[PDB]
Symmetry: C3
Subunit: 513 residues, 3 copies
């Protein structure tokens, strides 16, 4: 009762400091005007969330009883109003590009069919997530790709991440000298993994990382109707990695079902971490699209995993987000516990990219003299992955000249880890920013403006076949009483995870121009 | 009974080898003449410590019975003889510098008052450590700062550490090539942390590190009268770090009191390790002063922590130094176990200085555009820490032109780890060794000869708010039955630790010239 | 019953792919013709190993009953036929070099005598391993050093490892930039340790590493008659390191005898890993000889450890190779679990070579001013190790001009780890490949063609006194119920391990020219 006088008037003195700089020079005051008004607004929308929780059931009830009675009529309307909304909107994507963008919508159905025919419970599909999970990310993607204020936001939210890429050049220029531009990956990019792992833990300590997960999750919960753990983990995988998302719900992991656990694991493969998020940007990948792909992969993780292995028995656990809590004492412990957790994280990244990129040049040279058998060198591992994933590359709506070159990146990401796929993307990002020739002799040498947006989304996921060993061991270290359930669902989780990356990837193909 | 014939005559053959080179060319024979005579002498002073332990109680008793009877007179003399000794000596520090050196003595009382008014047991203070703990380091500091043979010793003991800074350039030039001068921190300085962690474990295996702790501790024990574990840990923190000092007494950690545990933790924050001791010297910090600060911080750790959280119940454990033992089989295991323990030690240092130095340039740029709100960039994190710790900087006797610039280092050391504070000190050490301008436009650009001695001592401690997370987890991993006692004393340990660094820092301010 | 139709006809489609490229251009088709015929052949020799296991006892029995009856005659023949075979062959090594190659054979007996006089069970020696364990590696060494098709094999098998040294330059040029030739050890050589630790685990997952151990082991088992765990571990130490070889038999480790455990530990010291095998080649060491030394050290490990601490009680365990099994799910988990196990492996190597190479230049400078006492600098640690191991260096048949310079490498390998010994060898490999002067002033400056083959074999082992701390802790972490047995045998294991390296080293001295 005594502490809040100090902390309150100081934060009320902050409200003095907001309105002080709001009066003079308001145009430079715009980010502080927007945030602190919303910072007042979201506390009000959360303090009245619990205080008016009585009226939350009292005001939602007289319509919902009428909505259940009108569901005899509404299920013939709302299920048919959206189909008319899609087909009318398919008259207005053809003006963008009739060639490939119809194939992307033709592929988005085909990825559903590739999961529905190969799901293990086809008749047990509860279609309310798996249609609306595409309906979320499409309504999410049409806001933040197609509409202009949504493009202004995630560009600016993308570009201010790019300023954090500069803030680590105080640390990486110090621990590694002024020559840190030499040896550019381990000395620039791996400090970004350290600095984002120390920001992610500060935001997790301050509750801000727990807060967005409870807001993105609850929006994704009620609209999809999944289990209340799964909406936390799938929305949690936007920010934290594949091995830290079930750590959010780790007291509740032995109690979930096999499909509630499958969709936890799939959402781990379907997205990237906020830790390695700035590693990918520093290669040269567009930050605005890669942030976009992480957000849309959370409803895609529901729309793929609840379609590929649906839930039957009972979602036994409710209200695990409010039970989800921290730990660290102060802020600078959490900035240290975030950095000391980045010890093994930048080490396992660095030795995989020694291990896996050498297994390129092994397999690019082993299959070279295996191809030299038939008078045919230029038979490489990269050429074989192009023709294996020529179906999935063209299915998500890539031009035929670039469908062969993007299918290397799916082959890089599925077999090897996705860092192999992103700088080999960023060798082709950076090559087209330079004004360069397309075909030097016959090599495609870059992709496009267009399908580098799609190949950004097709890789935004940890869904290599290598992380199946880490996620099994990561989940068995949490819930060892379900080791039979975790290991049996992991192989089903990659394909549901890789398609969940692709279901976001074709939505850019629908929304390309 | 058979082995000591081999080991004895070989070491007696060493005594032949001493006196051989002692006869011819004695002037080059001085370090071997001094050590091996003392090596005979300290074995004699320890073999007769146990053999004449009967007379140790028989000869100390007839005076101590008279000393207890004369304590009716001696407590009016010795408590008043020292006060007359101080005030007469305050007539002979003013000739050095009357401006700031009186403020340092004015600050040393003020740091006592800042702990005594904010101790939790003010009436329960047993003043025999907390006055003599300043009386030790002052008698220790006046010997090794003021007097000329004490200056010759710790300069030479400082300069021969600087030769170990060269000995790692066989290893760091090999593991990291001849280009190791590029990327100077991780490739020169972090091998010094490895090479000093492998020397510290060899000296711990050979007993030499256990021996100085039993000699510095027992001198600090009887003169302060603290608990016999605490005099081991506080003197142990001279050499080993904050997370290895309670490992010395780890079978005895669940049995200590809450204040015996507080002063264990505070001495961990109040000092530096011998591991990172050569990291600090390689930046450019004077080695003779930094070794001096580590020695004086052990009685300062008693004089601060027994003042800030005194002991009431009962010191239940005696003779834990002789119970303190190892482990490793041979010497070269201990040179490996010291190097393999330096895996996480140079890794957690390297990622913190990526994490924390980026959180400078985050907060130096976040508060820049927060200052740009009020038409005021150059509002940085560095400027705010200057005015927050302008009290403590000027209190320990720094010039007003340099009190603002040194208070950044306290702000660097309290919030971030002290490696941030030392190279930002060594940017200003190295800038004044070059003949440079003081004010370029208005920036102070270095400090002085004088207050770089004080700022050396104000930072010789692990007392950041970040290590409160490591020391809690480091002590809970040892004595998990006292987790409530450890976590409640850690916040009290930093302030008692940061002042214990400062109580050494003002003594250089008294002894500056 | 359904899966083998897919996997069979695909591998039968591979047999189509073999014979397709076998018809046209057979000269380029030679490695694929040799392997896949043998790949058919070894499956046939293993499918008929179990199917005709009934006739394996039915056809071996009518001769063995006659062999036991003729052993009254055969033990006077075969024990005397080999002695006549040796002495006749000692008439035909003198034509190669009568000076030093007789000393190598004179040393090979002397190493037996140095183990037999200092074994703890001299009367309990079962001489059937310890004579035939030299008889294996001599028959193994005469095939692959002396004979010309055996030289063609291990050169080509050596040179195709040298191609894997190039394959890591896709990974090390990426994680560490194009400037990775700068800082040549940690940025080129330590990725080779990563890439070979990720190949070794893939070959262990595919069974190919388990297969050669079951073939080299069973050949070494029946011919030596050791315990069936020990023939797995000693042959296993050809490939995996000292801390992963008892991990092969870790469910069976509390049941072995003290001498079965001694020879497990000794074989760990006597050989090198396949992990650090390409680290040694990248320094400049000849790959064909270093692969040769790893193969011959497995029978040398039997011939030394069963001689130095023989087995008395009972070999209680049989058929542990077939019980030896994995783990990892797919291949790319095992390529990740091999890389993530190389985290601590390249870190403990990198900090030891910071720790140990600095303890050269410490001891090279501490003994320098200890030598300056007697007007004698150039008294170094390197000079003392030359005269300590002048016996063992000349005993294995090195020229007297080079016996002093090679004995530094034994002193480098016994006290410090063998990476110190190999690049200080490869400073002298690389110096003689350049056309250089032998004596600049008096320094030998390289060795020879000849004794760099011997010094390659004298170092192919983990038998430093530093790894006694890792192997004790590595075995106690596996079988903690035998900690008294492991710690008592480790000191006996180094000397039996260092001689087992030397027993291979003198065989090159016999086979030098």
């Amino acid at each position: 009762t005594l502490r809040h006088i100090i902390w309150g008037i100081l934060l009320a003195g902050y409200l003095v400091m907001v309105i002080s700089a709001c009066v003079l020079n308001f145009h430079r005051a715009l980010p502080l005007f927007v945030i602190t008004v919303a910072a007042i607004f979201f506390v009000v929308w959360d303090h009245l969330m619990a205080k008016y929780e009585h009226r939350i059931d009292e005001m939602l009830s007289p319509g919902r009883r009428l909505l259940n009675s009108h569901w005899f009529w509404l299920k013939w309307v709302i299920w048919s109003s959206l189909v008319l909304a899609v087909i009318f909107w398919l008259a207005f994507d053809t003006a963008k590009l009739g060639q490939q963008q119809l194939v992307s919508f033709g592929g988005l159905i085909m990825y559903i069919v590739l999961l529905f025919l190969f799901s293990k419970y086809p008749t047990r599909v509860y279609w309310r997530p798996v249609l609306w999970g595409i309906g979320l990310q499409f309504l999410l993607g049409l806001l933040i790709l197609r509409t202009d204020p949504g493009f202004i936001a995630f560009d600016w939210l993308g570009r201010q991440v790019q300023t954090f890429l500069e803030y680590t050049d105080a640390g990486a220029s110090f621990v590694f000298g002024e020559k840190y531009k030499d040896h550019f990956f381990a000395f620039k990019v791996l400090p970004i993994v350290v600095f984002f792992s120390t920001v992610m833990s500060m935001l997790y300590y301050l509750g801000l990382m727990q807060w967005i997960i409870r807001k993105v999750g609850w929006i994704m919960l009620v609209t999809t109707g999944s289990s209340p753990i799964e909406s936390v983990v799938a929305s949690g995988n936007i920010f934290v990695g594949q091995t830290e998302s079930p750590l959010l719900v780790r007291p509740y992991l032995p109690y979930i079902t096999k499909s509630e656990l499958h969709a936890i694991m799939t959402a781990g493969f379907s997205t990237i971490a906020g830790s390695v998020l700035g590693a990918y940007i520093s290669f040269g990948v567009p930050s605005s699209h890669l942030l976009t792909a992480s957000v849309m992969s959370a409803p895609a993780s529901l729309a793929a995993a609840k379609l590929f292995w649906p839930e039957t028995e009972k979602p036994k656990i409710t209200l695990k987000n409010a039970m989800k809590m921290e730990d660290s004492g102060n802020l600078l412990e959490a900035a240290t516990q975030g950095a000391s957790s980045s010890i093994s994280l930048v080490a396992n990244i660095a030795v995989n990219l020694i291990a896996f990129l050498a297994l390129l040049s092994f397999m690019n040279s082993a299959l070279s003299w295996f191809g030299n058998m038939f008078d045919y060198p230029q038979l490489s591992f990269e050429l074989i992955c192009s023709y294996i994933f020529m179906p999935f590359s063209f299915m998500m709506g890539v031009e035929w000249q670039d469908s062969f070159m993007v299918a290397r990146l799916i082959g890089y990401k599925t077999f090897f880890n996705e860092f192999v796929a992103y700088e080999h993307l960023s060798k082709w990002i950076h090559l087209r920013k330079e004004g360069g020739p397309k075909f030097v002799n016959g090599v495609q040498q870059y992709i496009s403006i267009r399908s580098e947006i799609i190949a950004t989304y097709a890789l935004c996921g940890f869904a290599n076949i290598g992380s199946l060993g880490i996620v099994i061991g990561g989940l068995t270290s949490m819930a060892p009483s379900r080791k039979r359930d975790i290991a049996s669902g992991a192989v089903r989780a990659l394909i549901a995870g890789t398609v969940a990356c692709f279901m976001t990837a074709c939505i850019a193909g629908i929304l390309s121009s």
